[model samples]
Structure formats: structure tokens, C-alpha cells
Target: MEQPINVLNDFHPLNEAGKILIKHPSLAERKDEDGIHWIKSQWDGKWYPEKFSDYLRLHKIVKIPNNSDKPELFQTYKDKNNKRSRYMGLPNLKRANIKTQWTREMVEEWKKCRDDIVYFAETYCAITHIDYGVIKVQLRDYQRDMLKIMSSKRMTVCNLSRQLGKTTVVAIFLAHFVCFNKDKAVGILAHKGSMSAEVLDRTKQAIELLPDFLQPGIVEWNKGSIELDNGSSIGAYASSPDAVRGNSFAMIYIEDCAFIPNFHDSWLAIQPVISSGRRSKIIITTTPNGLNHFYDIWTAAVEGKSGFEPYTAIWNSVKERLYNDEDIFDDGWQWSIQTINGSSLAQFRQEHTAAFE
Candidate 1:
């Protein structure tokens, strides 16, 4: 199993309790008499202060061999000594500058995936399942339709309801964009920076779960952004006027823009950046959060005023989520309807029916 932290210590000469059962000083307690968190490094014997938490996060205490230069616990990748691995990504992952000898069949498959993102995602990509572990993606009808439509359009608006996996579709698309294209800068903007950062993590997970042949080498893998060896990058940012300052993003995906406070101000500031690229694209997905800037844009897009293809996906669009009244042991969505009831119809309409009221 992969460990959370890298092993940093070697076995020492100590008693059974002192060696195996003894708690590490960092884990045993954090503060000293001086009200400071301090730790002594075993490798360099350097005293580090106020950084024990970061040390624990990046490294762990394991009984490693004294002669082992690398702290490898499991199977070592064949490309462990790859130069890029030292600076970016895990040693096992594919990286740029590593020449790949592809068969003719591989070329055909890669081209087909480049032609259609839906095929690539459903066929090769893996996503974490709450009920199950990591599983191969099976895109629903609505998700496939949304992806196909968004792939062709320069600008699009999606009025998807809650629990319909709008964020999932974005992550899959974001992964496909980096691998298939080069010199591309993509961004995911949410109401808050933290929310957008979570999207990047999901994107990272998608990349990690892919087959080595289909996945691009990762050059940068941080929490808020990821760069590919193909010169493509995906960054997460809060929906703000200053988020795009001096950054030229080829594609932007605004998540839940309807729910963002003061989004009207940020939208104007972001337009110039989008306009800078001749073929720059923007995809906006959100729930119908009552009459707001998103609502205005959707209304205009529907009427051809805004240069966007308007799209909407409700709970019913997801085949598994049925609203049948006769089946007592139906899906949880039906259970939710029972809880929501016929009263508070407006909320019910927006949540399940994808209404913009």
C-alpha cells in the first residue's frame, strides 16, 4: 500500500518497547517548555522548529535500511531515475522527455480519443466511487450529451441540478484537454479558491487512475494547479476580478457561478482575458440559484443575445434517478421527494426539476 508520508528514519538499536512500541517524539507531543514545536531530524540531525507538522505531512518514521539511498517501500518504477521524477510527479508516473515507442494500434487509439473526449473518458479514465472504490467511468446520457455539446461550442452555459455530477464531467474534460493538446492553459473557477482547489485534486485523481499509455506525464502536481509535460496546465482559482490577472487561460470552467456573490463584477474583469485568445472557450455550469447574473446570461444565451449555447440537465436526465410514485423501494431521489413533499414547490422545482425560478 502507498504510504501517506515518505519514510525518513532507519532502524535503531533499542528495546522492544523503545523500538516498535515507543511513540515518536513528534507524534507523542507537539509543544515543548518554551511553547514552541521543535523536532530533531534523524537524517541530518538538524533542529527544525515550527515545522514538525509539515515534516510529518511529507515524511514518516519507518525502520528503513541504513544503506538504502532511496526510501522506496513498495515496487520501484522502472523509470525511478528519470530526471523529471526528481523534480516533479511520482517516480512511477509518466513524464515528458521519456521517449515512448508506440505501436500502430496505440496511434489509432490515441487519435480516436483525441477526436471524441467522451469515448476516451468512458473507455480509459477512472473515477472514485463513494459506494465502490476507483471504478471505470460510465458516462450517463446527460453527461455524454453535455460533453459532446461543450466540446464543439466556444462558450456554453449549463443549468444542471444538484447531485447530477456536473463537477465530475468537468474533471474528466479537464484531464482530456491536457493530454490531447499542448501549450494550453485551463482554469477552474469556483465561488471560493478552496472549492476550485478540490476540483484540481479530483483532476489529479483522474490522471493518476488512468493507464500509463493514455495518461500524460505530470510536471507539476500541487494542490491548486497541475502542469503537464505537454506544456498544458490546469489551475484552480476563486471567481474574482484579480484571479486572471496576467494569466492567459485558453479555457475556463466556472463552477456554480450562479451561487457566487458579486459574480457580476468578476465576470466583466474575466471577459477581457477570454477575449484575448482568438479561440478561447468558457464553460459555465451552475444550479438555477434564482434571478442573478448567471440567470441573466442563461436567458440571453437562450435568446441568442449572449454568445453561448444554453444547456440544462435535471435529476430526471440521470437514468438511475427515477421519480416513480408506485415503487415504494425506489431510489433515494424519490425518498428525497417524499421529504421535500409537494409543499415548498419552488424549492422542489429548482432542486430536482432544474427550474430557474
Candidate 2:
């Protein structure tokens, strides 16, 4: 069950306009049921219909707006550095003009991150935990190996089971790539819109957790896309033919690759768009789902016919060093194995063992 989040001092949801909205003479607390709250956008000189509640919900933070006397969670800002155009309603999202003084340690760390992505993720990237808000991500050996495979291969297909942090590692890599590159674009197209959104959220959380000195100043932050000051961008799209249409992505991550309803057609449509970039990459990750597009890709990859490199991860291979020795890997965890064992053998093999059905 989900519990309500107690608003922390650091939790800031509203962008500058929202900060202004709270203090605006237009801000009325009345139950004006039939009317809408229209806000004047500083950038476009147009009044956008926005509600106090809408900002909170749009950012998807768990905290409610506080009317307290203590320093407000968000601060109203002037159009300093002409960066007003970059601010979205998302809370704590960094925009340009966020300056940082690089120390000796920060400089050395930055160089190391520039050189080694695995080291960067293991050291600096922080991922969100359901139970705990932000936790440093510790990549298992296989997970790190998968990152290396994707980093090296132009076209890579990953066969992995659930709860292996497959997409999380991808998000970490995407964040690293966008930060280090210039004028590059990457994307994640997933089986569900919410799933892609969650991946972007993880990337956002990781960005926010980075040391200020290492963070690429953000220029645009939105639900579907994020653009950095360096002209790099990352977009999220649910499974659709229009995903990546008219957009050239430096890297295209196809999540749950086989499950898209029109997987073949969508791939056919986006193939040219992806390959147009001189250094474009396509990384597909999936659990076995029938003899579909991914199955075809996997077999072709295994036979060295497909341009992709095939990698498979089974449950036991990644189970090492997962938690408390007493409760996690020993007989105490057999209950989970037993529960999954209740599934039919074929179903178990397809999901847990990465077998094509």
C-alpha cells in the first residue's frame, strides 16, 4: 500500500510561474466551480488555463502545497539570464544559470565519469526507491556487463527477466550519454506510456541526484522530453508508429520490444529515422513474448545475421549479493521461488528463464 509523503523542506514542485501564482493577486481560494484558473505565461504572453492543483499533479510529487510561514518549498524567481523559457512546472528540475564551482575532487570525478560510464553510474547516479525516495544505485555484475554490451554495440538486444533493473540501467546510461554529448538526441519507446514515463522519471531523479558541478544545465524539461543546455535531448514514447517520427535520435531504446501491437511496422517506420544519425544506436530489451519481433531479432542476433548483439540474463545469474544473507538468498527466499514455481512450467521458462515461447 502507498503511504502519503510528508512534504520535505527540499521538495519543490512548482516552477517559477507557480511560485508567482501563489502570490499573484489572481490567486483566489474560492470554490469557483464553473470557472477555470487561467495563468499568464511569462514566455508566450498567453494566458494558459492552469490550476494550483494541476502543477502538483503534473509533476507527480506526493506533497501537497503548504501555506506555512517557513521558507516556501519553491522560490519565485525573476527572469534572470533570460532562462524563463526553460522552466517547466516540474519541481526541483534544474535549468540554466545553475552555476557550480568545480573542486579538485569534482574535476577528477568528472574526468573519470567522462572515461568510464560504469564507474560514473556506480559512483554518482542515484535512483529512486519505492520505499526510500532516493538511493544510490549499485549495479550487479551482470547489469554492469549489460551496460557495457549496450555501450559498445550499435544494435543490441537484451533478454532479461523482471525486477532485474534492466530499464533502470538503460536510464542511467541515457542520462550519462546526454550529459556527455552535444546536440545528441536519445529516446525510450516502451510498451506502455506510463512505463516510459517512469523511465524518464528515473532519469530525472538521477539527474537531480548528480553533483551540481556534473549536472548539465537543463534547458527544457517536460513530461515526454528533456532538452539540455548542450543541445542534447531525451524523449520518451509509448509503443506507437509515431514514436520517433520526424525525430532523429542518437540512441533509440526499445523497451519491451516484442510486445508492441504493430512491432514490425513501427520498427520499419523508425528504422531510417534512427540510422540517419551517423552514430545512432538501437538497444532493445525484452522478456520472451511469443515468436514475435524480438524473438526474430534474438535468433538472428545469436546466429550473427542480425546487426544486433544478443545478450541473455537469467534469474539465478543475477541473484548473487542481492541482500541480507539470512532473508534474501537462502531458504527464507524459497517462498518466492515456490510462488513463482506455481506457474506452469512453460510460463515459468518463458518469463523467469528467458525462453521464447
Candidate 3:
């Protein structure tokens, strides 16, 4: 016989209403104007008639004379007169009077967390490899440094080799960007609609895999778009002059621009949206599909003729994968002295090296 359906795990048959109800049972009860269903306790200023574990953990409970034998969950302190007094709720606590011992440490940590995107990505992001399935991101030194530059620079052009996890890095960066920035929109463009959609899927998957505290509430998610509860969103599309023309974005990313037929037109059209006197950023990355728009942009950036910062990654950066002794038969990439065409290895090096020339 077929197994009985479990609502938590097998709720695919349920409609949207059922899903909503299952996710939020408090909605079934009447609530106040602010949508708070439970009543706040006068003792601790916390909503009770629900789980009180978190509230109890953050405070100490006390009992007064003539009260019940059970100690009530409340905050207590000594007044200026050296008399013990009941610490009332935050409704009357002055922010200026609040004392914090770890203010400096907390502020420092907060700034570090916000400013270091590479650390955030390495700590929280995960990617899927064809052979390894899902794996946590442990970036190489070069990749980490590259991400640091990308995070700080507003406009960047990346020329990276295939299979160097460049796409994965970009997806993780996008996830970090959207999660932290509220009410911002990010647009991702690719040479093809399917490629952009795949990146969107990868980003969504990464977000879903994040720990609960690190994951943002997803308000809307689809094939090529994601909207977070913080009012931020990410949308993906194929590169074209009209693809991102009307949409306003806080940041933009274009992938494989060298292969994009209308790269110049697409970049020109999207410039206004990102350059409208806002602190917006854009990243364009691709492997060399043979000196095209990407080359021109990289050359201009090198000459200080453009605002973009350039980054390049070659195959040798990830040579550990090629040089590993595990399974040469299955990998099919055993190195040889020369190619079948009798040309020197220089031809292969030219395509794989990080050098722009």
C-alpha cells in the first residue's frame, strides 16, 4: 500500500491556502492591529499564552509577597535608593539609560561582518558540483581576494577560465547582496535566458540551504526571480537592450558577455538604471570566447580609461583538480607533452592562463 501523506513533507498536493495555514497557525486567531495574536504579560512585557522559553532565558523571574508560590517571569533590579524594585517592561526604559558592556565589540563585529563579503560568503554559502553534489564553499586564496575586490569595487570585469567556480562565486555574491540590502533590486543577465535562469535557481538553492538565522524570508520565488521579505529582489534575463531597460536595479551582473551578441547595446541600455546617482554596482564576467567586448572593456580598464576594475583567473589557479592523483582514467585530463596537432603546449596555456595578453 502507498504510504500516508505527511503534511510537512508531502504537502505538494495542498493548495496555496493550505500551505499558508500550515506555515502560520496564529493567523487562525484574532489579533491586534499589529497582527500580534498573543497577549503580552504585564510581568515581563512579553507575549504569553505561547512559548515562554525564549522570554524566560533572557530574563530572571521573581515572586512578590502575597503572590502565587510560583515565581513569575519578570526582570528585577535595584533602584537608586538601594531598594529592590520590579524592572518594568521596555515601554519605559530610556535608551540613554541602557548600559551595554559589549557595545564596542558588537559594533566592531557588525562592521566586520557587513564589510567582508568574502568572509560572509565562505561562512554561509554552499555550492553544488557535478561530482560532489552539494558542498560548502571553501574559497582559494586568489578567489577570496578576488571576491574582496569585487565587493569593494563598484564596477568590475572578470575574465575567468571555465570550471574555476566563477559562476558559483557570482551566485553566492548575489545571495549575500540581496540578503543584506533591503528594498534593493539586483538584475542578472546572461547570454541566454536559460543560463540566467540557471543562475537564479542556483542562488535560490543556496539561500534555501542556509541556516535558519542566516536565511531571509522569501516572499516570492520563481524560475527567474526572487523577492525577499525585506523588499529586496533578484531578477534574471537574457542580455538585450530591452531585457533590463525599464527595471531599476541597485546592482547588475552580466555573465558570459563575450558570447553575448548585443553586449554593447545591452550595457548601454542598462547604464542609466544603475548610474542614476545611486550607489549602484555592476559586474561583468566571462571566459575568453576570443577577444570581443570583454577584451575591450578589460583593456580600457587597464588603461584607466574606464571606471571598471579588472580581475582574471586562469586554469592554474585551480590546478589542484588537474594534478590530483585520484582517478586519471575517469577524469580524462591526463597531461601530455604536446597536442595531437603537434603544436606546443603554449596554445593550451594561452587559452587557460590568467594573463590578458
For all candidates in order, the CA lDDT equals 0.68, 0.65, 0.60
Ranking by lDDT: 1, 2, 3
Model 2 compared with the native: what TM-score? 0.68
Residues 34-95, model 2: lDDT tens digits: 36554443222333334434433333433222212332211121222343422454334456
So what's the TM-score on candidate 3?
A: 0.62
lDDT of 3 by residue, 1-357 (tens): 477765344231112332331122222232354332343322223333232333234343222112112222111111223122112321211111233333454446445546788767765566553444545666665577667888889998887766577767777788888877889999888878899998888887676655333455656667989787678999988788776767878888888887888677887887776564775788888777667777788889878888888887765455233221332111113332222135444454455554444
lDDT for model 2? 0.65
Predicted model with the maximum TM-score: 1
Winner on TM-score (1 vs 3):
1
On TM-score, who's better, 1 or 2?
1
State every prediction's TM-score relative to the real structure.
0.70, 0.68, 0.62
RMSD of each: 22.0, 20.9, 23.8
Ranking by TM-score: 1, 2, 3
